[PDB]
Design an enzyme around this catalytic site. Structure first.
Site, PDB file in Angstrom:
ATOM      1  N   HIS A  15       5.907  -4.845   5.002  1.00 24.36           N
ATOM      2  CA  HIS A  15       7.293  -5.039   4.617  1.00 24.36           C
ATOM      3  C   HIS A  15       7.591  -6.529   4.503  1.00 24.36           C
ATOM      4  O   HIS A  15       7.493  -7.260   5.486  1.00 24.36           O
ATOM      5  CB  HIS A  15       8.209  -4.389   5.651  1.00 24.36           C
ATOM      6  CG  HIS A  15       7.920  -2.940   5.872  1.00 24.36           C
ATOM      7  ND1 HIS A  15       8.742  -1.936   5.403  1.00 24.36           N
ATOM      8  CD2 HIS A  15       6.888  -2.324   6.490  1.00 24.36           C
ATOM      9  CE1 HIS A  15       8.232  -0.764   5.734  1.00 24.36           C
ATOM     10  NE2 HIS A  15       7.106  -0.971   6.392  1.00 24.36           N
ATOM     11  N   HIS A 193       6.151   6.682   4.538  1.00 24.61           N
ATOM     12  CA  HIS A 193       5.893   6.638   5.971  1.00 24.61           C
ATOM     13  C   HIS A 193       5.917   8.064   6.498  1.00 24.61           C
ATOM     14  O   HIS A 193       6.872   8.800   6.260  1.00 24.61           O
ATOM     15  CB  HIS A 193       6.955   5.804   6.690  1.00 24.61           C
ATOM     16  CG  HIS A 193       6.723   4.328   6.615  1.00 24.61           C
ATOM     17  ND1 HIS A 193       6.605   3.651   5.421  1.00 24.61           N
ATOM     18  CD2 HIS A 193       6.605   3.395   7.589  1.00 24.61           C
ATOM     19  CE1 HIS A 193       6.414   2.367   5.662  1.00 24.61           C
ATOM     20  NE2 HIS A 193       6.411   2.184   6.970  1.00 24.61           N
ATOM     21  N   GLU A 196       4.337   8.408  11.955  1.00 24.42           N
ATOM     22  CA  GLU A 196       4.404   7.246  12.832  1.00 24.42           C
ATOM     23  C   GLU A 196       4.980   7.719  14.159  1.00 24.42           C
ATOM     24  O   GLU A 196       4.275   7.787  15.172  1.00 24.42           O
ATOM     25  CB  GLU A 196       5.285   6.147  12.226  1.00 24.42           C
ATOM     26  CG  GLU A 196       5.387   4.880  13.078  1.00 24.42           C
ATOM     27  CD  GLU A 196       6.281   3.817  12.453  1.00 24.42           C
ATOM     28  OE1 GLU A 196       7.042   4.151  11.517  1.00 24.42           O
ATOM     29  OE2 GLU A 196       6.224   2.650  12.900  1.00 24.42           O
ATOM     30  N   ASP A 274       1.869  -4.500   8.675  1.00 23.87           N
ATOM     31  CA  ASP A 274       3.168  -3.820   8.684  1.00 23.87           C
ATOM     32  C   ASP A 274       4.382  -4.756   8.741  1.00 23.87           C
ATOM     33  O   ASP A 274       5.004  -5.043   7.718  1.00 23.87           O
ATOM     34  CB  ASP A 274       3.237  -2.805   9.829  1.00 23.87           C
ATOM     35  CG  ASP A 274       4.426  -1.874   9.710  1.00 23.87           C
ATOM     36  OD1 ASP A 274       5.268  -2.090   8.815  1.00 23.87           O
ATOM     37  OD2 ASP A 274       4.518  -0.924  10.508  1.00 23.87           O
TER      38      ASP A 274
HETATM   39  O1  HPA Z   1       6.690   0.544  10.066  1.00 20.21           O
HETATM   40  C1  HPA Z   1       7.804   0.931   9.824  1.00 20.21           C
HETATM   41  N1  HPA Z   1       8.181   2.235  10.123  1.00 20.21           N
HETATM   42  C2  HPA Z   1       9.495   2.668   9.860  1.00 20.21           C
HETATM   43  N2  HPA Z   1      10.400   1.830   9.314  1.00 20.21           N
HETATM   44  C3  HPA Z   1      10.025   0.508   9.010  1.00 20.21           C
HETATM   45  N3  HPA Z   1      10.708  -0.611   8.444  1.00 20.21           N
HETATM   46  C4  HPA Z   1       9.759  -1.695   8.391  1.00 20.21           C
HETATM   47  N4  HPA Z   1       8.571  -1.249   8.897  1.00 20.21           N
HETATM   48  C5  HPA Z   1       8.739   0.095   9.273  1.00 20.21           C
HETATM   49 ZN    ZN Z   2       5.818   0.188   7.981  1.00 19.91          ZN
END
Ligand code: HPA
Ligand code: ZN
Length: 313
Positions: A15, A193, A196, A274
């Site tokens: 990001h 995503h 996670e 990330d």
């Molecule tokens: O790694 C992530 N996960 C969820 N939201 C996010 N916003 C920036 N990085 C992430």
């Molecule tokens: Zn991310």
């Protein structure tokens, strides 16, 4: 480390807003005449303690206040590209969160201009190929995402894909099935995503509903043997982020991390930083952590680096 740093890599899970170094944040706040809540760089830097994803997001979005002009977004992106050159990342497919900025009043065109300009320098000066990915904020409504996609259409050729980030738990991929459907129809590839903090089910939804080309994070797939067998079979890439998972408490320790296990089983896992400014390490620092805490070998090093090249969109 130096050997790890010398490897040619591709970063596919990053990001741009998450590369906002504390120092840069202060400098941009100065240039924009913004009074920061934080007293000094050190005070902001110690605020980087997270119990979960949300605590990080709250701060993550807070820092985005200093991003106000084209030159701001250029500086942000250019600083990262320079780190890429330093760590021999030869290819980038970065995320950005247009809503974070547009909802703050910043024109869409301004955000893209700054980033795009930096990407241009990245390729002609640094020799770094890029593939910009527009990410939707999943805690917000699909309607709000539709409005964002409409903004993006005239620009569509600037994005190789659309993504999905932010608060995972309670906002399943299915919530955004329509806009993703429309995105693909308009010529966008998709990623997301999944797994996670969210359950394996979310990952299935990403694969089958949003029809992603790769899963971002995806570590909780380890709980689903049926899913694992699919991943291995379909060679669907996983953009794993070691330091992020550690900092957000997905794993209580780096020795607990399952990315090498996945690698040996045949999963097309990759290494990514990330949100590097927040987790204290860029991609090379991520490879390194795997070596120190998991006894990763040069063997698995070359393999992970290669997968990231192979998994380029
Ligand atoms: O790694 C992530 N996960 C969820 N939201 C996010 N916003 C920036 N990085 C992430
Ligand atoms: Zn991310």
């Amino acid at each position: 480390y130096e050997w790890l740093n010398a490897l040619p890599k591709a970063e596919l899970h990053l990001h741009l807003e998450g590369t906002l170094e504390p120092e840069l944040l202060f400098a941009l706040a100065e240039r924009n005449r913004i009074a920061l809540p934080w007293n000094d760089v050190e005070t902001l830097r110690k605020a980087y303690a997270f119990n979960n994803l949300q605590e990080f997001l709250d701060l993550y979005y807070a820092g985005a206040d200093v991003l106000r002009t084209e030159q701001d977004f250029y500086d942000l992106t250019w600083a990262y590209l320079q780190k890429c050159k330093a760590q021999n990342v030869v290819h980038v497919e970065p995320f950005f969160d247009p809503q974070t900025h547009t909802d703050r009043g910043i024109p869409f065109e301004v955000v893209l201009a700054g980033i795009r300009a930096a990407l241009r320098d990245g390729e002609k000066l640094l020799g770094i190929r890029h593939g910009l990915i527009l990410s939707f904020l999943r805690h917000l409504s699909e309607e709000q995402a539709q409005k964002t996609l409409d903004q993006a259409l005239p620009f569509r050729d600037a994005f190789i894909a659309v993504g999905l980030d932010s608060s995972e738990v309670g906002h399943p991929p299915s919530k955004f099935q329509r806009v993703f459907d429309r995105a693909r129809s308009e010529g966008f590839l998709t990623v997301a995503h999944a797994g996670e903090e969210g359950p394996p089910e979310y990952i299935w939804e990403a694969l089958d509903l949003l029809k992603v080309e790769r899963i971002d994070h995806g570590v909780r797939a380890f709980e689903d043997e049926r899913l694992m067998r699919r991943l291995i079979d379909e060679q669907i890439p996983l953009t794993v982020c070691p330091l992020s998972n550690t900092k957000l408490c997905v794993f209580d320790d780096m020795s607990q991390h399952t990315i090498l296990d996945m690698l040996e089983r045949g999963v097309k896992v990759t290494v990514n930083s990330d949100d590097p400014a927040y987790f204290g390490g860029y991609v090379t620092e991520n490879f390194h952590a795997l070596q120190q805490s998991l006894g990763m070998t040069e063997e698995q090093a070359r393999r992970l680096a290669q997968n990231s090249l192979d998994a380029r969109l």
